[PDB]
Amino acid sequence: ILQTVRIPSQRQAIGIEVELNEIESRCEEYPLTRAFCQLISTLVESSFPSNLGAGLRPPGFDPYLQFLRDSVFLRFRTRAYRRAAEKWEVAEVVLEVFYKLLRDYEPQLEDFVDQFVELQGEEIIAYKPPGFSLMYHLLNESPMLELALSLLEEGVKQLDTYAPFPGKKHLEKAVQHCLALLNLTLQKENLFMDLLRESQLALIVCPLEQLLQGINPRTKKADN
Amino acid sequence: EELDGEPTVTLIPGVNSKKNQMYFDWGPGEMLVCETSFNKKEKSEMVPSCPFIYIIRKDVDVYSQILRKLFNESHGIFLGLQRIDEELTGKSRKSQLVRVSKNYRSVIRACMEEMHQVAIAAKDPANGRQFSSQVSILSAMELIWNLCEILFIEVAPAGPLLLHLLDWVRLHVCEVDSLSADVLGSENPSKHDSFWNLVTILVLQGRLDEARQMLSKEADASPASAGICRIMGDLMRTMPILSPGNTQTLTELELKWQHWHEECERYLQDSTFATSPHLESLLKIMLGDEAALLEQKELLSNWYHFLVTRLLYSNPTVKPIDLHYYAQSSLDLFLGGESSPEPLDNILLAAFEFDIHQVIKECSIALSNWWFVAHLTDLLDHCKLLQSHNLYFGSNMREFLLLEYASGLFAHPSLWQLGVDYFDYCPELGRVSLELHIERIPLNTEQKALKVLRICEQRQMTEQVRSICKILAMKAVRNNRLGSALSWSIRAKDAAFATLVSDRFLRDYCERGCFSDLDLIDNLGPAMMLSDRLTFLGKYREFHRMYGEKRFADAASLLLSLMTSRIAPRSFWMTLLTDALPLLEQKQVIFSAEQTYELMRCLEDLTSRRPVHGESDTEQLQDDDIETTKVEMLRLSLARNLARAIIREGSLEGS
Amino acid sequence: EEIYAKFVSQKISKTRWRPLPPGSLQTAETFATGSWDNEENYISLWSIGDFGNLDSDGGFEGDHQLLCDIRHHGDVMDLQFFDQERIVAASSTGCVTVFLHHPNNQTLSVNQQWTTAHYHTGPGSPSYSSAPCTGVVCNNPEIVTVGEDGRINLFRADHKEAVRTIDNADSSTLHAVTFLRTPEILTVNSIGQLKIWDFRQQGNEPSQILSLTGDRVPLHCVDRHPNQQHVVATGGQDGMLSIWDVRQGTMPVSLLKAHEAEMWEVHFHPSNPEHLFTCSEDGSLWHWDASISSWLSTDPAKDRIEITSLLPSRSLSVNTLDVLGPCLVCGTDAEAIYVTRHLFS
Amino acid sequence: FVARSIAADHKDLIHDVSFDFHGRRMATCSSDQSVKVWDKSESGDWHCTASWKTHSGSVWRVTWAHPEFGQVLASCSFDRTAAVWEEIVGESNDKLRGQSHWVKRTTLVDSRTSVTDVKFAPKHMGLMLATCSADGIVRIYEAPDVMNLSQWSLQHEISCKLSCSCISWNPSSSRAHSPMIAVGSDDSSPNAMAKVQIFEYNENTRKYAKAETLMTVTDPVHDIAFAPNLGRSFHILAIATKDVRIFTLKPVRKELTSSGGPTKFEIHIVAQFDNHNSQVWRVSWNITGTVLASSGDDGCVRLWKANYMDNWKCTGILKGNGS
């Protein structure tokens, strides 16, 4: 119902990655996507299996995170909405999922070791855990960090009018989880950076303390 | 006068000129030739030769595969030149034109030493000699351009003119630095046999602290000469050479150089160097001794290096207005009167006489490609130096040269766009020279033809626009692409071609029961009116956009309007009558009594003009079985609608 | 920063970036070009020169290095990558060719070829005439192409024949083509229309037609927003830029003047798609930033689109562009290519 | 000049060669009774795409129409005919194995003697075709439809009163010069004092009136060519005879009193060249009319150009080496 196995002869996706982009993006109303985010939002607080997808693909969570990150979240601002509120109702239920995944994650040294698995005779690397995928996409100048910092800017931009607006409470929550994700990165960064220095992995990541001082491409200031 | 040599002789392989005649024709960059022989075997066993065709491409050297670099990089500089403002003052513009000149030199250089590596990489000595020959031509071009830049573009004043002419020689007479590397690479540089030749050649190039450093390898090796070698060396440090960062007069340089000359001659009178004849020669050379300088002729590879040496040691305050006298007098003394000058000597002499037009003329005789003369002549118009003379055919000298370079760019598959830029700046003949080439660009794609149309439309070349649009409409008609055919006849505005494509669509309808397009006939807009028959096509399509668009009596009155128009072809009037049958025999009267009269009139304007002629052939009967059936169904339905109409209409005149 | 121009002594009709590995952190290192209008046309692979070093002996190594080439037949009308080793090209011969790169050798080769994909017909014999193939779009394993013959083809990178053909989908030239949804394409033509086609339907007829109001402006190019499969941009014979929502009537939502001439390509940024780029026969190349999506505003005097000419003077025609991450490349009739590594600095 | 070469495989002497308007196709004709068409590939090669029998005699010329009239060829013959040919797309009738897709649309038959030359008109006159023949007549034909190329009208018989060897239309698109045709003569008689004649279309009579006669061309003529008009107030005319000749023809401005008559010309010889040491057998101009080519019994094509002073000179010699 998410296609986590994409076949080399297959022109079309299958599942909600079609029904979002063909049906909900046609209606301008997004009940299937928000119920599917609310589904994942329960299933992380009852934990996911480490062997999820094993023997059909590399094990772990990142195929579901790719969908939330690159098919839902980075597209929530490009889509049109019949309910001008639902732009923010989608925004709550995806940042909740990321917040829970970064809350319940704790950095470990094996996260910085590439673990191999046998798939149909090939020796393939297992997916990195969702909290490390979130940390790597939050300790770089990512489109995820752009959309997050340009939500914190956009939240203040609406609140400094003091006005009511359709969907306001879900924007206040979307700003809430967006702040809480930064504060979880700051409360986990030194350990993630020191385990990267002990493990010698060929990655580069920058402190969030310093990425918050990146030149905001909207305002052309360091104003994050 | 001009062209008083033998006319340039091409040799054609296989072709046996020794009795055989020829036929020929002209394409855009290639001329055909064919020979009048055919070998009808006098009994010999050998294969008989067929006749052969030859494709003979223009000598303007555009097809040396490296020089494509030269043409594009120089066109970028030419658009960098025709985009210079005229109000840019005579210091900003002059600096910018000196940059344009040095940009062109950089492209000659960057093609030449690429071609030098290709000559070294040439795995056959024939090919290596062909590239080496074109390297020598690019060297002669950058030699002449470096002089014309100093004399006409930067226009070097008295004093600096000698500095300019010293590094002018040096950037082409590169023999010296190559010899310097071999002498310096030896275990004992002062004992390489060419060491003293190199010491003299560095003094002939004025490279005096480099000559002093070579003389120091004798002083390190030879404690008997070293004291005298250091007198020579320190005279090679007291010479008054001009320094551009230095606030002196020419008369200060002159009076200081006169002391230095009186001091050098003093050491010759006291016989200071008569212990080493090489140092005695160097003192005579440094004093401007024209006999000792000619004793060095086997160390002076050309007469213009001898000229610049003679100016350095005999006239350091030389002016442009003196210079011809020295140039000729140095050519005289270098050739001695038993040799004539070569074409390069005639070009360089004319540059030292400052005759730009004799320079342009001999460059047009010595160089196989208009490229050099075109960009140089145009840059001298950007400096405003040319004689504005009209020729016997109206056009000016710059234009006459640019028209033949444009007639070299249009001789190539890609370079024709650059040939349009080179036709627009030609005021008497440019447009007409463009109008004879522009229709002959191969139109492989509609996209390419849009660029050519846009170029003609910008320039108001309306008859060439009509031509190209009809060539495209005819591409489409021979390929039956009726939508391109109609859209191109509309861009041509040819009403006969618009009627002709309509008299395909109306037959394409008869051959199918439908058109090959509908959107193209609905979206005719104002362009529907390009002919009467295109209006009939648009409005017969519109009848098929009323009968299907939920309506009928409007469609019926449009059908009668199509029929009563002096436009509808009578070979289709039986169709328009048949199209009325589903409207006539309706339960509602759709046509009135008087509309039914004009429909019957149109049936008789088909039928009661048949001829009464007889007896051939049997084949024919099978559609008159059908025509009589068509006509009786029309008689019957028209009479039935007329009767229903008269009863309906005569009950509304009295109720 | 500065834009690094290179002369190549062939007119460049098309340029494309090599698609990055899913989850790499590299910039765009390699691009492909195709040429037109020569005595010999080619397809060529290039690496961006590294402007960061001098070695001890002082040479300028920062030039865009040619990795390898292959000679073409006709002109390279359109060009696309199919994966990281395969490239597809159209031709003015009506041919369509798939090529393969060989990284271990630095060569190109043919992989498969359809020498009769596009052709004009005549009455009663298979003596076919060449029809220029004008545009190509890939959806691996799948490939679609258009031409002067008004034909649509569906091909595959495992099949030698057509999987489907649609002859006379227009009576005029079709210029360009894009995938809305995998079985569902959109094409543009000489009339000023967008025609939508569904390969599931068993007729040859268009699923939907869109147009301008009445006046015939040929539409030369088309792209479809990376996150919005219903948002389409097209470019006109006049130099107009038209934005469409293919769900809402028959007309564009937004109509913008982009050029003083024929607009040859339009592209949305593949990761930043509130950014757009366009090139033209007026010799200009423009960047557009607009950060409902701003591209669907009916009042471009309220919602901001800021508009920057990237080239410092008008060249000869700019036939093509491509943009990947911070890198942009374009190709011209001045027998030259232009590259930047940075577009956001 | 860089020479590429092609084996022509004509089974007897070739008499003529002609390019298409774009220089992408060429036609050649022979004493073997054939015409061939050869097309220039997008690789820079050339291939024989059609090779068919056109006539019953030796073929003496071949010529193309302007491409706003499609892909049309004309050929003249010793059997006294001319024939018009169209390239059709998709018409190759396999029932009749080894016919060409170049279809004969008509044969013109009115010439009493060998048809020596054939030339399409400048396109601003419509789809007109001139032929000439050794009966001393030039015949001018017209297609009233560009599609039904089977139907040709005969609009003019022009009586030269000497055998006709070659013809040249004046290429002036300017509406300030009337349609003109120049005619050469092979006549070896010493009684006919002039071998070139020039005719002007006089609308007020709808006839090709004789304007001029070149009283200095006493010797037989093999070929003749007007130079493409770069805006010039005067025409230029090249002639192939015992020598090469270049004439200027400058229209005398009519005063507002000489009604109904043809134009008169101020005529000069600008050049006469013996340097073939032999008879001259063709004359053809480059696209701009600035360079002449001519051939002779010396086995050389010679190139001739005006310099900046209108001194016409030889500029190049294209000659076979026989290696």
Q: Please give the Cα distance from C168 to C119 (Å, whole number).
A: 11
Cα B491 to its chain centre, rounded Å, is: 28
In chain D, the residue whose alpha carbon lies closest to the alpha carbon of C74 is D42
Which structure tokens are listed for C121? Answer: 């017909």
Contact: C142, A11; criterion CB under 8 Å:
yes
Residue of A nearest to C292 (CA): A80
Of A13, A8, A4, A17, the residue nearest C141 (C-alpha): A8
- Residue A77: list chain C partners with CB under 8 A: 293
Measured CA to CA, the distance from residue C149 to residue B46 in angstroms comes to 50
The CA-based angle B182-B188-B189, given to 5 degrees, is 45
CA–CA separation, A158 vs D240, rounded Å? 91
Interface of B with D in 394-423 (CB under 8 A): 394, 397, 400, 403-404, 407
CA-to-CA distance for C21 and C23, rounded, in angstroms? 6
Cα separation of C85 and C104, whole Å? 12
Specify which residues C79 forms β-bridges with. C89
Min Cα distance D259 → chain B (Å) is 31
Distance of CA A114 to the CA centre of its chain: 22
Q: Where does residue B615 fall: left (phi above 0), alpha (psi -120 to 50 degrees), or beta otherwise? A: left
Helix (H) or strand (E) holding A37: helix A31-43
Contact yes or no for B392 and D309 at CB 8 A: yes
Q: Is A46 on the interface with C (CB under 8 A)?
A: no
Residue D67 in contact with partner chain B when CB distance is under 8 A: yes
Of C141, C142, C228, the CB nearest to A25: C228
- Count of helix runs (H) and strand runs (E) in chain D: 0, 25
Plot region of D84 (φ>0 → left; ψ -120 to 50 → alpha; else → beta): beta
Give ∠ CA B224-B228-B230 in degrees, rounded to 5: 110
Q: Answer positive or negative: Cα dihedral of D29, D35, D38, D39.
A: positive
Q: Cα-atom radius of gyration of chain B, to the nearest Å?
A: 43
Partners of D203 in the beta sheet?
none
All partners of chain C with 3 or more CB pairs under 8 angstroms: A, B, D
CB burial class (10 A; 0-12, 13-18, 19+) of residue B370?
A: buried
Question: SS3 for A81?
Answer: coil
CA angle B47, B49, B50 (to 5 degrees): 125
Q: Which of D224, D250, D221 is nearest to D237 (CA)?
A: D224
> Is B630 in CB contact (< 8 Å) with chain C?
no
Taking CB atoms and an 8 Å cutoff, what residues of chain D touch B429? Answer: 230-231
Q: How far is CA A132 from the centre of its chain?
A: 11
**CA B432 centroid distance within chain:** 16
d(C-alpha B198, C-alpha B207), whole Å: 11
Resolution (A): 12.0
C-alpha torsion sign, points C336, C337, C340, C341: negative
Tell me which amino acid residue D114 is. S
* Non-local CB neighbours of D77 within 8 Å, separated by 6+ positions: D54, D55, D56, D57, D58, D59, D60, D83, D114, D115
- What's the alpha-carbon Rg for chain A, to the nearest Å? 19
Are residues D269 and D215 in contact, defined by beta-carbon separation less than 8 angstroms?
no
The residues near B308 (Cβ < 8 Å, ≥ 6 apart) are B162, B165, B166, B168, B169
Asked if A175 and A201 touch (Cβ cutoff 8 Å), the reply is: no
Nearest to D76 by CA among D114, D110, D20: D114
DSSP B522-540: HTTGGGGGG-HHHHHHHHH
Distant-in-sequence, close-in-space partners of D86: CB < 8 Å, separation ≥ 6? D70, D71, D72, D73, D102, D103, D105, D149
**Residue B495 DSSP SS3:** helix
Residues of D in contact with C73 (CB under 8 A): 42-43
d(CA D64, CA D86): 10
Residues with Cβ within 8 Å of residue B621, at least 6 apart in sequence: none
Half-sphere exposure of D311 (CA within 13 A, CB side): 8
Distance from the Cα of B52 to chain D's closest Cα (Å) equals: 5
CA distance A223 to chain C (A): 16
Q: Which residue has the tokens 């060539």?
A: B471
Angstrom distance (rounded) from CA D290 to CA A75: 66
Longest pairwise C-alpha distance within chain B: 149
> In 3-state terms, what secondary structure has residue B376?
helix
For every residue of D183-244, DSSP letters joined together read EE-----SS---SEEEEEEETTTTEEEEEEE-TT--S--SEEEE---SS-SSEEEEEESSSE
Query: Which of D73, D98, D99 is CA-nearest to residue D86?
Result: D73
Choose from D40, D45, D89 for mutation: most chain C CBs within 10 A: D89
Q: Kindly state the DSSP code that residue B380 receives in the 8-state scheme.
A: H
* DSSP sequence for D112-131: SS-EEEEEEPPGGG-SEEEE
Are the beta carbons of C313 and B83 separated by less than 8 Å? yes
- Residue pair B374/B387 in contact (Cβ under 8 Å)? The answer is no
CA angle B22, B26, B28 (to 5 degrees): 150
As a whole number of angstroms, the distance between CA D182 and CA D165 comes to: 11
Residues D92, C120: C-beta atoms closer than 8 Å: no
Beta bridge partners, C288, equal C276, C307
Give the C-alpha separation, B237 to D248, whole Å.
70
Q: To which residue do tokens 């990237």 refer? A: C310
Chain C closest-CA separation from residue B195 CA (Å)? 28
Q: Say how many C-beta atoms besides its own lie within 10 A of residue D44's C-beta.
A: 12
Q: How many CA atoms lie within 13 A of A207 on its CB side?
A: 8
Method underlying the structure:
cryo-EM
What residues of chain D lie within 8 A of the CB of B54, using their CB? Answer: 3-6
Query: In whole angstroms, what is the distance from residue B151 CA to residue B130 CA?
Result: 32
Determine contact: B652 vs chain D, CB below 8 A.
Answer: no
Two structure tokens written together for D89? 């797309």
| CB B9 within 8 Å of CB D319 | yes
Chains with at least 3 CB pairs less than 8 angstroms from chain B: C, D
Distance from CA of D52 to the nearest CA of C (A): 17
First to last CA, chain C: 7
Instruction: Please tell me whether residue B151 adopts helix, strand or coil conformation.
Output: helix
Sign of CA dihedral D97, D98, D101, D102: negative
Measured between alpha carbons, how far is D93 from D248 in angstroms, rounded to an integer?
A: 51
Q: C-alpha distances in angstroms, D303 versus B365, B410, C328, D23, D314?
A: 16, 19, 51, 19, 6
| Cβ–Cβ gap C139/A26 under 8 Å | no
The DSSP secondary-structure symbol of A143 reads: H
In contact, C229 and C180? CB cutoff 8 Å: yes
Bridge-based pairing state of the strands B8-12 and D312-320: parallel
Structure tokens at D75: 């050929």
C-alpha angle with apex B29: B25 to B32, nearest 5 degrees? 25
Which residues neighbour B629 within 8 Å (Cβ) at sequence distance 6 or greater? none
| Nearest partner of B229 among B247, B245, B202, B211, judged by Cα | B211
Tracing tokens 């698109």 back to the chain, one arrives at D173
* B299, two tokens: 């160390």
Pick the closest to residue C189 from C151, C138, C244, C144 (CA basis).
C151
| B504 at interface of C, judged by CB pairs closer than 8 A | no
Q: Which residues of D touch C129 (CB under 8 A)?
A: 89-90
Q: Which residue has the tokens 């210029």?
A: C175
CA dihedral in degrees (D301, D306, D311, D316; nearest 10)? Answer: -30
The SS3 of residue D171 is coil
Any long-range contacts for B640-645 (C-beta under 8 Å, 24+ apart)? B640/B584, B640/B585, B641/B584, B641/B585, B641/B589, B641/B590, B641/B591, B641/B596, B642/B593, B642/B596, B642/B597, B642/B600, B644/B589, B645/B589, B645/B591, B645/B592, B645/B593, B645/B596
Chain A touching partners, 3 or more CB pairs below 8 A = C
b/e string for C53-77 if b means 16 or more Cβ within 10 A?
eeeeeeeeeeebeebbbbebbbbbb
3-state secondary structure of C34: strand
The Cα–Cα gap between D22 and A149 comes to: 62
Q: In the sheet where C231-236 sits, what is the strand order?
A: C219-224, C231-236, C240-245, C254-257
C-alpha B133/C-alpha B116 separation (Å) is 10
Residue A25: its chain C contacts at CB < 8 A? 228-230
Helix or strand (DSSP H, E) at B404: helix B397-409
Residues followed by a gap in chain C, C→N > 2.5 Å: 291
D68 vs B432: CB contact, 8 Å cut-off? no
Q: Is D99 on the interface with C (CB under 8 A)?
A: no
Between chains, do C134 and B447 touch, taking CB under 8 Å as contact? yes
Interface contact C40-D101, CB threshold 8 A:
no
Helix, strand or coil for residue B255? helix
Give the span between the Cα atoms of B212 and B199, in whole angstroms: 8
- Give the span between the Cα atoms of B413 and B415, in whole angstroms: 6
DSSP 3-state of A180: helix
Other CB atoms within 10 Å distance of the CB of residue D313: 16
Do A and B share at least 3 CB pairs under 8 Å?
Answer: no
- DSSP-based three-state secondary structure for A213: coil
Which of B1, B4, B15 would best serve as a mutation to test chain D binding (most D beta carbons within 10 A)?
B15
Q: Which of residues 13-72 of C touch D (CB under 8 A)?
A: 39-41
- For D268, the token pair is 């000069």
What is the signed CA dihedral for D291, D295, D300, D303, rounded to 10 degrees?
-10
- Tell the residue number behind the tokens 């490279």, with chain if given: B207
Contact (CB<8Å) D92/C128? no
Q: How far is CA D148 from the centre of its chain?
A: 24
CA contacts within 13 A on the Cβ side of D304: 27
Is the bond into C19 cis (omega within 30 degrees of 0)? no
* Peptide bond just before B617 cis, omega within 30 deg: yes
Contact D84, D127 (CB under 8 A): no
Please state the φ and ψ torsions of residue D142, each to the nearest 5 degrees.
-145, 130
Chain D residues whose beta carbon lies within 8 Å of the beta carbon of residue C128: 90
Task: With CA atoms as reference, report the closest residue to A109 among A132, A135, A127, A125.
Answer: A132
Collapsed DSSP state (helix, strand, coil) of residue A105: coil
**Token representation of residue C341:** 């590594």
d(CA D304, CA D271): 10
DSSP A19: I
Provide the shortest C-alpha distance from residue B380 to chain C (in Å): 24
Q: Which residue of D has its CA nearest to C125?
A: D90
Tokens at residue B487, please?
């859209």
Nearest to B36 among D7, D13, D318 (CB): D13
Whether chain C has a CB inside 8 Å of the CB on A47: the answer is no
Residues of chain D positioned with their CB less than 8 A from the CB of B467 = 66, 68, 123
Which amino acid is residue B465, in one-letter code?
A: V
B54/B33 Cα distance (integer angstroms):
5
Distance separating alpha carbons of residues C133 and C175, to the nearest angstrom: 9
Beta-ladder partners of D130:
D119, D140
Choose among B104, B142, B157, B88: nearest CA to B379: B104
* Cα–Cα distance, A44 to A31 (Å, whole number): 20
How far, CA to CA in Å, does A33 sit from each of A38, A67, A119, B564?
Answer: 9, 11, 31, 64
Q: How far is A21 from chain C (nearest CA, A)?
A: 7
CA distances from B467 to B290, B303, B445, B473, B479 (A): 70, 58, 16, 10, 18
Helix (H) or strand (E) holding B364: helix B356-366
